[PDB]
Structure 1
Amino acid sequence: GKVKVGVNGFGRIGRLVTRAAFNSGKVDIVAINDPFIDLNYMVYMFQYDSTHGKFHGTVKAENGKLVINGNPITIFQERDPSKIKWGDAGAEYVVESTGVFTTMEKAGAHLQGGAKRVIISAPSADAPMFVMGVNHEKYDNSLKIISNASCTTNCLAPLAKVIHDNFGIVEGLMTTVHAITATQKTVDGPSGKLWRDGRGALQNIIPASTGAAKAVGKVIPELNGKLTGMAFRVPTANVSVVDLTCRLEKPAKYDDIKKVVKQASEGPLKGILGYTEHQVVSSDFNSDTHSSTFDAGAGIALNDHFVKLISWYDNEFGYSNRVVDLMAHMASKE
């Protein structure tokens, strides 16, 4: 009864989503589209990974199809999304991960090819946004084009939801120390709009602006206009962290915050929000599937109404697993 999924784009997010789908088994990948990557290169790129290690399984090419663990996958090389024959391959859901089709009008071209629903693995200007464990109960089958927001938003939303439900956030500012991404450059090089983003990634911290904190207001309507922040890009492979400073409506000692966060991570947000009291560092969360992990020992509170909270997140694996979970929930809602 597992839904059939097609993936548009074999970049980092697409490859990691395919890996998560094959590791968990919640969905079945049946088609992939990439106009610039051939079959043998696809096999090479899927087999080896610098950050997450060698794939645990078998991958090979046979009769022009990518075979992963014995399951053949159809390969397309179309540049126009409306010309991809998703229906012929049997793909019911399509994951749009290229990062250039984010509006509803642009992302709706996949429906012309026979797909039933489209999931955008990035922030969208007009498509509805859903975060697993926060507002995923709001989804309905009436929706064909939705969005899974972003990694930073997926890390910030559950902790913010717990804190707001228990103590009433009045206003907060967020800072995230983020690992390097594919949009950056090894050495000083041209960068059209963001001049800072063109500087050498290995030698600098390159501050940056982000909209995840604002998008939390879209995910949680009561927090609209009460959050915002920025980011710093450090020369680290993948693991990233979130730092939230907020003012609370009700008094809250740090012990009470720890207790409520642990209780939330146990029952309701199990597998989404983690909790740890150990002396962890960034590399301890490599290949971790949690959306966010609360670091009890790293935070600090000035008084009962002004605190700073720290949460870790693997911006590669966690987001891909969340995408797979959202697709599984959508299939169950059918």
Structure 2
Amino acid sequence: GTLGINGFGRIGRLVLRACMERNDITVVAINDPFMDVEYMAYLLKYDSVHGNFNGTVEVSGDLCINGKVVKVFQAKDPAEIPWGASGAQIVCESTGVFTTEEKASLHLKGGAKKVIISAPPKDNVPMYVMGVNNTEYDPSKFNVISNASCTTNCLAPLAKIINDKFGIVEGLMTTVHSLTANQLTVDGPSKGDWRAGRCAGNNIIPASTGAAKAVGKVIPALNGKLTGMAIRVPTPDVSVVDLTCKLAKPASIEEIYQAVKEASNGPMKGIMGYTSDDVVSTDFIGCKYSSIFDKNACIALNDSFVKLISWYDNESGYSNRLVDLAVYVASRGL
């Protein structure tokens, strides 16, 4: 099982870091036109959130990472990356700019077998969330797939647990989200979300997100039952889902906590997690879970109307899931 990374940004780099921990997948090639091999090595080695790389990085051609050659490309066009020549079977598409089947499928010209878009698609490319719907993937039906967003990977396991046990009548989500690369250090033009181009470090910034409605595709039972928005805040990493939902059957916070705990310790092992501790966002830097239920941050109006809080490391948790999905895709054939 081999991986090619297109876009060696926050996600692309953390995807590589994930694989280096992993014994069943190897990164064999990187493409990023906006960084030469020297710059690539540096951005791998040093991370403002996730620390010094654990292991070795040197420049050869190409990178030498933990003693193994990783082929390096700088092409604008995905059609042009020789994935097949490099021996790269799966492409992690993490540029943020090729989020359709049309665009992402061009990786197949270079001889890749499969492509995982590291974002929700602008089209109807199927979205998979590990531990929720990933086994619905049929290798004979799709070559380009999406891993959804960080926010969807946080909400979907939570939604599934809550829907299955109690039934969600209606739900509205806010995600309070750490800043990302699309934001700006000072007020300037976006490309060109006017709010997102306001000085990122001193603002609370409302944003649109499709994450909650996306849960309605991932879990078709919840189609039309969920929507949401995001609030961007100055912190460098880690985000939180605030889910306000009406339930079809009564449930106390305690009963919801047990349903979470059941799934965390069984079917959603490693995907859903939980805590009753006085946690804050930085406590989840490096967390590999998709969704961490915060018991003591939740509040109920009554037995039917509830506000649930779940954490996610939007960089690290999502990147692990993308690696999980790639390992899953490989095990299914091609």
TM-score (norm 1): 0.97
Which of 2, 5, 9 pairs up with 1:11? Answer: 9
Q: Quote the Cα distance in structure 1 between the aligned partners of 2:194 and 2:31.
A: 32
2:84 is the counterpart of 1:87: yes
Equivalence for 2:120: 123
Deviations 1:145-180 (A, max 9, x none): 111010000000000000000001000000111011
Residue type of the alignment partner of 2:134? H
In structure 1, the residue corresponding to 2:84 is in which secondary structure?
A: helix
Matched, 1:30 2:24: no
Rounded to whole Å, the distance in 2 between the matches of 1:193 and 1:60 is 38
Per-residue CA deviations over 1:115-164 (Å, capped at 9, x if unaligned) read: 11111111112211100000011011112111101000000000000000
Which of these residues, 92, 96, 102, is aligned with residue 99 of structure 2? 102
List per-residue Cα deviations over 1:66-117 (Å, max 9, x = no partner). Answer: 0111110111122221111111111111111111111111111111111111
**Amino acid in structure 2 at the alignment position of 1:117:** K
CA RMSD of aligned residues (A): 0.9
Query: Would you say 1:270 and 2:269 are equivalent positions?
Result: yes
Letter of the 1:36 counterpart: F
Aligned to 2:332: 333
Task: Give yes or no for contact 1:131–1:154 (8 Å, CA) kept in 2.
Answer: yes
Distance 2:7 2:254 in 1: 45
- Identity across aligned pairs (percent)? 66
The answer to whether the Cα contact below 8 Å between 1:99 and 1:122 also exists between their aligned partners in 2 is: yes
The answer (yes or no) to whether the contact 1:8–1:94 under 8 Å persists in 2 is yes
Which letter does structure 2 place at the counterpart of 1:307? V
Report the equivalent of 1:75: 72
- Could you list the runs of 5+ residues in structure 1 that have no partner in the other structure? none
CA distance in 1, matches of 2:101, 2:112: 14
Offset at residue 65 of structure 1 (A): 1.9
* Distance of 1:280 and 1:151 partners within structure 2: 20
Aligned to 1:111: 108
Give the one of 50, 65, 68 matched to 2:62.
Answer: 65
The CA deviation at 1:34 is 1.3
1:212 aligns with 2:218: no
What is the identity, as a one-letter code, of the residue corresponding to 1:53? G
| Distance in 2 (alpha carbons) for counterparts of 1:77 and 1:210 | 31
Q: Which runs of 5+ in 2 are unaligned?
A: none
Do the aligned residues in 2 keep the contact of 1:178 with 1:239 (CA within 8 Å)? yes
CA drift at 1:192: 4.2
**Rounded Cα–Cα distance in structure 2 between residues aligned with 1:258 and 1:30:** 42
2:252 is matched with 253
What amino acid maps onto 2:289 in structure 1?
Answer: H
**2:315 — aligned with what?**
316
Q: Alpha-carbon deviation of 1:5?
A: 1.1
Q: Does 1:39 align with 2:6?
A: no
The answer as to 2:167 corresponding to 1:168 is yes
Q: What is the CA-CA distance between 1:236 and the residue it aligns to?
A: 0.6
- Equivalenced residues, count: 331
Q: Which residue of 2 aligns with 1:242?
A: 241
Q: Deviations over 1:198-247 (max 9, x none)?
A: 11111110111110001000100000001001111111110111100000
SS of 1:279's equivalent in the other structure is coil
Query: Which segment is superposed worse, 139-148 or 320-329?
Result: 139-148
1:7, 1:191 → 2: CA distance?
A: 26
d(CA) in 1 for partners of 2:116, 2:269? 24
Residues 26 and 324 of structure 1 are in contact (CA less than 8 Å); yes or no, is this contact kept in structure 2?
Answer: no
